[PDB]
Each structure stands twice: as structure tokens, then as C-alpha cells.
């Protein structure tokens, strides 16, 4: 292993440091301007560079180790006694499914699914609402010659029926039983990559990382490898909570090890969602455009 240049001595302006790691939703970038979010982001920026220092010296030898450093950072930002600590600390296990309902703060994703060039029209058969027309984005990967289904987005299009039907269901089963159904089976939701695929994806991420810490790549090849690493890590969503932050941390740390000071993602571009809504090569090709490289 050959030492890399390490983090750039020319740093992002403080305004930009305070957007590293931000979720700049197009319908609500107010959170990115709060003092607590600016401090979280600047902390991520500094910790990324500290990890890049170590990568550049050969002190972080695997992607798993880099992800652990990102996880340690993310856990350190939780409040003392946070009940979500275990979830932010833990990989998803193969006995479980993972679901994010497309409710706030994810409402901007609804139109991205409905309007997606690669969306499909499907019929979702739900035990409470019955048959629902859905727009579906089926994210997939191809590794070692085989397809791997990743994240699946669904948005239900018969909204008048849904409002009337959900009102109905609530009284019979109790807000309790309807809420149980909606946490897992909300008509608009992301069903995430099966955790059974994490061993193979983790191995691939380790291979990408070893490639990406080589001293012989061009800047173009490095940025593509960083984009690919980000895509696989965010789309795999390895942990129960915090995967998006950890994936961005890792991608930026790898860049910083090479002296690249990547700017914040643009307003309106939430990187993990952009990854989950794209195929791999599509994402690699658009990655630079997602970053706010304007002067």
C-alpha cells in the first residue's frame, strides 16, 4: 500500500462544511439552516477528514472498518439515553424485512416514483385496502453475472379511495391495529434490500474500497469508484438506522484520502434516495451533477 495525499489543505468554506451530510429535501430545506443541523454537518465534515487521514496512511484496511468509523461517528451525535441507539449501532439481520413509509419527510419521493421513466404499473393486493393500482420502481443490481433486487418503491394512485377506505378501517380495528398495518404496509412505501444479500454486498464493498485506495487511479476513475461505493452502500442500506449518513461519510472519507474535497450535495438532492432511485451506472454518470460544484 502506497501512502495517499490525505485531506486537502484547501478546505470547503464553513457554509459548505455545514451542509455535509444534510438531507436537503426539495420541499423542506429549513432543517439544513438550523444551528443543530449545521453543527451536525460540520462535525461530519471534520470526522470524515480525520478518517481520510487514516485511510491515507494505511490505518483503515477494509470497507467494514471504514463503516465502523462512520457508525462510531453517527452514534456519538445521538443524545445520551437515545432509545434508537441499538438500531443505529446494528446491522440488519437476515430474519428481518425493512420498510420506510413514504410520509414526511419523504413526500418529495412520491412524485419521483410516479414520474420515473422506469416505473411500472402494478396491482398491489393488500389484505385491508384490497387491490390498489401502484406505480412501482424496482431497483436492481447486477453482480457477478446475477441480478440482485434492491429497493422497491410503491406509490398508490387511487387517493380518493384510500382516504375513504382508511377512515373506514380505523374504527373497526382501532387506531392500534391500523397503525400496525401502516408501519409495514403503508400504501406508499419503500421495501428495502433483503438483508440476506448483505454478505455478498459487503464483500463487494470491500473489493471496491481496496480498488479505491490505490495510488494509480485518475481523478475521473476515482470519482466513479467513489460514486459506485456510495451507490452500493446506500442502496444496500446495511444497518437498521443511519445507513444513508454512514454511506455518505464513507464515500467522502475515501475522496478525502486522495485530497479531494467534495462539496455538499445540491439543494433538493438527498443522496441515498437518488441512489435508491437509480441503477448503478446511471448513478455513477450523474454523481458529479448531484454535487454542488458551482462557484
Amino acid at each position: 500500500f502506497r501512502a495517499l495525499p490525505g485531506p486537502s489543505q484547501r478546505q470547503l468554506e464553513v457554509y459548505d462544511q455545514c451542509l455535509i451530510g444534510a438531507a436537503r429535501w426539495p420541499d423542506d430545506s429549513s432543517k439544513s439552516n438550523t444551528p443543530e443541523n449545521r453543527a451536525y454537518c460540520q462535525s461530519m465534515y471534520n470526522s470524515i477528514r480525520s478518517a481520510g487521514d487514516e485511510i491515507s496512511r494505511g490505518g483503515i484496511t477494509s470497507f467494514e472498518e471504514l463503516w465502523g468509523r462512520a457508525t462510531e461517528w453517527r452514534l456519538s451525535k445521538l443524545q445520551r439515553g437515545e432509545p434508537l441507539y441499538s438500531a443505529f449501532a446494528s446491522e440488519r439481520t437476515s430474519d428481518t424485512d425493512a420498510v420506510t413509509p413514504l410520509v414526511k419527510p419523504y413526500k418529495s419521493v412520491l412524485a419521483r416514483v410516479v414520474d420515473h421513466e422506469d416505473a411500472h404499473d402494478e396491482i398491489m393486493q393488500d389484505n385491508l385496502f384490497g387491490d390498489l393500482n401502484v406505480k412501482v420502481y424496482r431497483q436492481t443490481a447486477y453482480l457477478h453475472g446475477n441480478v440482485i433486487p434492491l429497493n422497491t418503491f410503491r406509490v398508490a394512485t387511487d387517493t380518493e379511495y384510500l382516504r375513504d377506505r382508511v377512515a373506514h378501517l380505523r374504527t373497526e380495528l382501532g387506531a392500534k391495529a391500523l397503525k400496525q398495518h401502516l408501519q409495514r404496509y403503508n400504501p406508499d412505501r419503500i421495501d428495502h434490500t433483503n438483508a440476506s444479500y448483505l454478505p455478498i454486498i459487503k464483500d463487494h464493498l470491500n473489493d471496491l474500497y481496496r480498488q479505491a485506495i490505490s495510488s494509480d487511479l485518475s481523478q475521473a476513475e476515482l470519482i466513479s469508484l467513489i460514486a459506485r461505493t456510495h451507490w452500493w452502500a446506500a442502496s444496500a442500506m446495511p444497518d437498521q438506522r443511519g445507513s444513508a449518513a454512514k454511506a455518505e461519510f464513507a464515500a467522502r472519507a475515501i475522496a478525502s484520502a486522495h485530497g479531494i474535497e467534495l462539496p455538499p450535495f445540491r439543494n433538493g438532492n438527498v443522496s441515498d434516495i437518488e441512489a435508491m432511485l437509480s441503477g448503478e451506472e446511471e448513478f455513477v454518470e450523474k454523481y458529479r451533477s448531484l454535487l454542488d460544484s458551482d462557484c
Partner: peptide, 25 residues
């Protein structure tokens, strides 16, 4: 008709907006 997602108004059973984990069926 309501916008997408806007069928879920004033519902005490609305889902919370983050990733949840469940045992496989």
C-alpha cells in the same frame, strides 16, 4: 382527488417517517 400521499390526513394511525424493521413472515 387528493395528491399522492395526501389520503392520510388527520389519521391517528399514520405511520412514522423512518425505517422500521420487522420479522420476516
Amino acid at each position: 382527488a387528493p395528491k399522492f400521499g395526501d389520503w392520510d390526513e388527520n389519521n391517528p394511525s399514520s405511520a412514522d417517517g423512518y425505517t422500521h424493521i420487522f420479522n420476516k413472515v
